[PDB]
Amino acid sequence: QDILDLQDRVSAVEAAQADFVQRSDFDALGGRVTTVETRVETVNNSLTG
């Protein structure tokens, strides 16, 4: 019955996995977002002073 109707379902999700994102990749971006978040406030405060 299950001759091999799963050999396809393996590579099936594997193709989508080849794309998606990456933990480190996303994390690097979060650090930059935090740095810019602090930088905006620093610029605002210095210029307001």
Next chain:
Amino acid sequence: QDILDLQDRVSAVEAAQADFVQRSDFDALGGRVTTVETRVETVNNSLTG
């Protein structure tokens, strides 16, 4: 022995894949972050001048 104890393990990871993220999706956001990074500096420099 392996009657079909993998037919489940296929859809198993496929469910998690249906969520996660997307290359293009993440990339679009990275470009916006870069634009904000440049814009903060531009605003700071113009106002400081």
Next chain:
Amino acid sequence: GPTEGTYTLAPQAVVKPAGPVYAPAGTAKISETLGVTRTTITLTGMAPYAIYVAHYHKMGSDGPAIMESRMIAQASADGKVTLTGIVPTALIRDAAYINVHHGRDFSGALADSGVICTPI
């Protein structure tokens, strides 16, 4: 012989900043005498040019602030604020944390809600 060379310039790629690193840090010296308190908060690594209102927040974190303790000052060109204030002891009774904030104006105002805080 006016040796002249004309060169087009490239738009670069590395534009990291050059100046005070916003890394808040400092100490406090609350000194009681004969019913009066003199508080000196010397901070370094702050915003280069910014007003830094600091007062005593009571326990409750949120909590009210005994605004009869607002110490106001601006920073230098490296980020060094020196807050100084005179407050009756009976006023600062039941205070919990000296919270430093950012000042929208030299009249005070809490732009930020706690960039640095010390338990008293």
Next chain:
Amino acid sequence: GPTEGTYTLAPQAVVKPAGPVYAPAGTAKISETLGVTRTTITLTGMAPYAIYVAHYHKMGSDGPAIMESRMIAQASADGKVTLTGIVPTALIRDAAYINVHHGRDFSGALADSGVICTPI
């Protein structure tokens, strides 16, 4: 004096900005008299001390500003700006919308391309 004290600082966990919240709202009110039109628009929740140039843009949303309908003002300190103006009703006969923009300077060009807009 008789009592001292020394406390090193700790920069909290999260610092939250206070003051006005950028929530643009508005209230346009036209009153077209004999070949003339007065327009008093009250914008609350805007940017604390910003410029707010406002015009009547023709159809073509998108389309050209009737530049002879410019109204300019500042938003106080909480983001409250009031725009008033007077323009013959013949020039604004094809206005389709009143687009409010931000300003670069007192009597000058735009810094945005439309923050808030009402359809007419």
Next chain:
Amino acid sequence: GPTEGTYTLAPQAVVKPAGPVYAPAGTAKISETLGVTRTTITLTGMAPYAIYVAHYHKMGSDGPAIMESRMIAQASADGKVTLTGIVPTALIRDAAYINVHHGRDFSGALADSGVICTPI
């Protein structure tokens, strides 16, 4: 009397930025005469009203800077900064690239570390 009107306003979604555009471009002019060197770095598409301190950085490519070629001037209103300056050729020796930076004030100082640059 006159026809009235009182539309409620509506925030727009894509409040796109307007005004000039940040694209550092430029052309340098290293005219050299008897023993002095006048250099006209004309830059365009820069930051509207910013300071642009530019000098000659020696081989080192972050290296040391012959500061005795500082040119400080401001960027007009559309980013049209025009730097000029005289320096004895003897001091220039071993300079490899004319780096353009942003400034913190007309008194020199360094804000950005290399917005635009060219070899020689």
